[PDB]
Amino acid sequence: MEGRLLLLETPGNTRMSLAYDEAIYRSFQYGDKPILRFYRHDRSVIIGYFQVAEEEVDLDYMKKNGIMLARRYTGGGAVYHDLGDLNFSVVRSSDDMDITSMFRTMNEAVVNSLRILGLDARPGELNDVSIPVNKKTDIMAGEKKIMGAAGAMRKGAKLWHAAMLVHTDLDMLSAVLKVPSTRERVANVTDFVDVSIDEVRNALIRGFSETLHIDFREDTITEKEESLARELFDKKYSTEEWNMGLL
Numbered sequence: 001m002e003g004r005l006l007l008l009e010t011p012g013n014t015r016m017s018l019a020y021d022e023a024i025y026r027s028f029q030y031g032d033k034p035i036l037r038f039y040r041h042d043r044s045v046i047i048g049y050f051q052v053a054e055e056e057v058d059l060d061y062m063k064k065n066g067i068m069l070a071r072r073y074t075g076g077g078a079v080y081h082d083l084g085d086l087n088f089s090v091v092r093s094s095d096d097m098d099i100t101s102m103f104r105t106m107n108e109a110v111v112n113s114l115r116i117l118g119l120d121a122r123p124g125e126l127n128d129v130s131i132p133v134n135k136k137t138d139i140m141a142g143e144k145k146i147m148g149a150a151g152a153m154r155k156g157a158k159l160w161h162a163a164m165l166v167h168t169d170l171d172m173l174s175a176v177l178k179v180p181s182t183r184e185r186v187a188n189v190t191d192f193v194d195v196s197i198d199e200v201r202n203a204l205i206r207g208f209s210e211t212l213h214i215d216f217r218e219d220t221i222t223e224k225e226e227s228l229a230r231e232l233f234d235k236k237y238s239t240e241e242w243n244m245g246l247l
Ligand SMILES: [N]C1=N[C]=NC2=C1N=[C]N2[C]1O[C]([C]OP([O])(=O)/O=C(\[O])[C][C][C][C][C]2[C][C]SS2)[C]([O])[C]1[O]
Pocket: 046, 072, 076, 077, 078, 079, 080, 081, 085, 087, 088, 129, 131, 132, 133, 135, 138, 145, 146, 147, 148, 149, 150, 161, 162, 163, 164, 165, 173, 177, 179, 182, 185, 186
């Protein structure tokens, strides 16, 4: 019933940040303490595992605007991050391959968390990975999308991480993402309530702790995980083939 709260952050280097994520996920062994991690990235665009950078973003807008490009290990679509976006990961032991329940359980925690801040949100309704919003992996506030998520499962463990728009530059995100209006489908938590990243982070800590019945106590990354991250970075996340989507 006890867990690890990791405020493991690496703004400035999204690629190393994602390496940390996969590292805590891959080092995890069945029975370990559940993990909840919070982190932010500076202006970045993160594409999914099955995505190709040039098909989701403009290598120019990003070039000219100092937008970092990075590809995560989980599936899903392309999202824009800035210090106004709050990302967070959950890693727990797994006894099945049921993906729907993971997303279902994590959204319940997000909903209970946001409620503490007076923001009434709900999960999307459609099962279509190709649509930008209203999916069951999305959390909507009103008719706008405020958080998207993705996940992975392997023998003994499951991973779920999301991106929540708190006070992100939405115009920026819309301009950089190739879709086909985007500006009209997203929203920041602060468009609703005047709360800070810490307030949102602290709300989520409570929500997840109460919903999952896990007492997440602030901790630090281990040397083992820290080493695997360094290796995942040097051998993968730091390469162009990976971030372009070829590896
Ligand atoms: N950031 C954010 N949040 C929310 N939302 C969004 C963003 N950006 C952008 N956006 C929107 O969304 C969409 C997309 O779709 P999808 O496919 O669902 O995608 C997702 O969500 C994914 C997930 C992510 C996770 C995190 C990241 C890194 S690691 S964690 C688009 O287009 C728009 O509209």
